[PDB]
Design a protein around this ligand. Structure first.
Ligand SMILES: NS(=O)(=O)c1ccccc1OC(F)F
Ligand SMILES: NS(=O)(=O)c1ccccc1OC(F)F
Ligand SMILES: NS(=O)(=O)c1ccccc1OC(F)F
Ligand SMILES: [Zn+2]
Ligand SMILES: [Zn+2]
Ligand SMILES: [Zn+2]
Length: 454
């Protein structure tokens, strides 16, 4: 039970306005032939241009929405739109580039996919709402064959050159003219009623139709994200390390310990209500406090309603560590992912949400400032009651209102605490650069922390 059988049936009803007369009975085998490719009985790791939902989910980082619209084949120019926001016009004689021939269009398609995907994926998965012109356009800029490696490295080839008759990965594809062994998935085979627009708009108010190919391409990918990551969720599935995953996660664990430990020391809450990930550990195992856990899986669609999560949390402090609710109570410590962040780890999502893909994939509900009215931003600080002592660590003295140690209260930061500061400030910047935001009860006062040494 691995790949999508080329002998699987393909519903053709969606194709038949662009391709009048097309058989009702069709398989991927026959369709690929119709699109102008020859498969060639080959068991060389490309058993179908089209892939399963489950294969597509495993490769969400490679999704590029793709759509073609006929401005007038041979007898007209095509507008190629992608979920990058790009719109190319090929003639056969927001970005909306005027009409150019296919030899320049195909060089642009490769540069664009290469730049979008080189730090994301070893492939591209073109995500379609297929009506016909997109599948018949592919012969103009795609080549298939055996799986191959890059001539310049050990990565799988994603592009081909007719000039040099060679193959390249997304990093090494510079000047190449053909997308080589792309994947595709037609969303219309998933069993939908009505047009793209009608199905997209059930779920998302953020993308409109400006009757242009890239809008359709963005809506297609969005709907696919909704069906695969909002309505269905599979946290089992692991995804490869492509970036600062490991640093971000350790950083997140250190800020959590720091912030919660400081909060218990300053304000001495007698009980902490820990609300989220049902696997969560005590982030401050030594803290003198009644730790009570409450189970809530990551909400992928709408932020939890606080009225439904609590049905005496007004006692002590509530810890929502990436537990997204509509309105945090005033007595909260909070870490919320800011869906608006631009990164390799954070893919555009559904209805202003974002798909954050770090070991596991988490569609996150759109960031809302109004959730935080009862709180304030957590102020930066580093705190340590650890003993000053180097043991074992550079030194160019550090100069800070925010280094809260016995040594700096004194006026002479020790070497161990000056390193730990610099480290902590790195982890902190790291976590914020990654898109997380920290929020605390309004009564939280850094000045209180100086009196936790006497
Ligand atoms: N968060 S809470 O403790 O108010 C809660 C939430 C959902 C179900 C039960 C429940 O507690 C009650 F069962 F004891
Ligand atoms: N911190 S808090 O948000 O739990 C809170 C709220 C109202 C009154 C006191 C109070 O405690 C304060 F001392 F911290
Ligand atoms: N509240 S305070 O006066 O101690 C202070 C002043 C400027 C910057 C940070 C800061 O807090 C510090 F504890 F981290
Ligand atoms: Zn390469
Ligand atoms: Zn959308
Ligand atoms: Zn010290």
């Amino acid at each position: 039970p691995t790949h999508l059988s080329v002998d699987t049936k393909f519903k053709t009803e969606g194709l038949c306005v662009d391709i009048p007369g097309i058989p009702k009975d069709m398989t991927y085998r026959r369709l690929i032939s119709m699109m102008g490719f020859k498969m060639n009985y080959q068991v060389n790791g490309y058993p179908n241009m089209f892939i399963t939902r489950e294969e597509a989910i495993r490769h969400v980082r490679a999704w590029i929405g793709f759509d073609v619209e006929g401005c007038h084949g041979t007898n007209l120019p095509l507008q190629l739109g992608f979920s990058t926001g790009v719109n190319l016009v090929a003639v056969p004689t927001p970005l909306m580039y005027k009409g150019l021939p296919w030899n320049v269009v195909r060089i642009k398609i490769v540069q664009m996919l290469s730049d979008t995907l080189k730090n994301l994926s070893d492939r591209v998965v073109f995500v379609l709402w297929a009506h016909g012109f997109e599948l018949t356009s592919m012969k103009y800029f795609v080549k298939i064959g055996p799986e191959r490696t890059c001539c310049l490295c050990d990565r799988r080839a994603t592009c081909f050159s007719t000039a040099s008759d060679t193959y390249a990965c997304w990093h090494h594809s510079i000047g190449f003219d053909y997308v080589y062994n792309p994947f595709m998935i037609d969303v219309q085979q998933w069993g939908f009623t009505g047009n793209l627009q009608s199905n997209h708009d059930l779920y998302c108010q953020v993308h409109g139709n400006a009757h242009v190919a890239s809008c359709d391409a963005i809506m297609t990918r969005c709907l696919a994200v909704h069906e695969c990551f909002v309505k269905r969720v599979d946290w089992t599935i692991e995804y490869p390390i492509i970036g600062d995953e490991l640093k971000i996660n350790a950083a997140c664990r250190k800020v959590q310990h720091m912030v919660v430990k400081a909060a218990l020391l300053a304000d001495k809450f007698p009980v902490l209500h820990d609300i989220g990930n049902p696997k969560a550990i005590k982030c401050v195992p030594q803290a003198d406090v009644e730790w009570k856990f409450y189970d809530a899986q990551p909400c992928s669609d709408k932020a939890y309603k606080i009225e439904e999560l609590f049905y005496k949390f007004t006692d002590g402090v509530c810890l929502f560590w990436n537990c997204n609710v509509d309105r945090y109570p005033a007595n909260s410590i909070v870490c919320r992912f800011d869906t608006r962040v631009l990164s390799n780890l954070n893919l555009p999502g559904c209805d202003g949400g974002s798909l954050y893909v770090n070991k596991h994939a988490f569609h996150t509900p759109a960031f809302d400032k109004s959730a935080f009215v009862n709180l304030k931003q957590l102020p930066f600080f580093y705190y340590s009651d650890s003993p000053c002592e180097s043991h074992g660590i550079d030194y160019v003295p550090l100069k800070s209102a925010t280094c809260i140690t016995r040594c700096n209260l004194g006026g002479a930061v020790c070497r161990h605490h000056a390193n730990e500061y610099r480290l902590y400030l790195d982890a902190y910047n790291m976590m914020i650069s990654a898109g997380f935001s920290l929020w605390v009860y309004k009564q939280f006062d850094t000045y209180n922390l100086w009196n936790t040494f006497t």
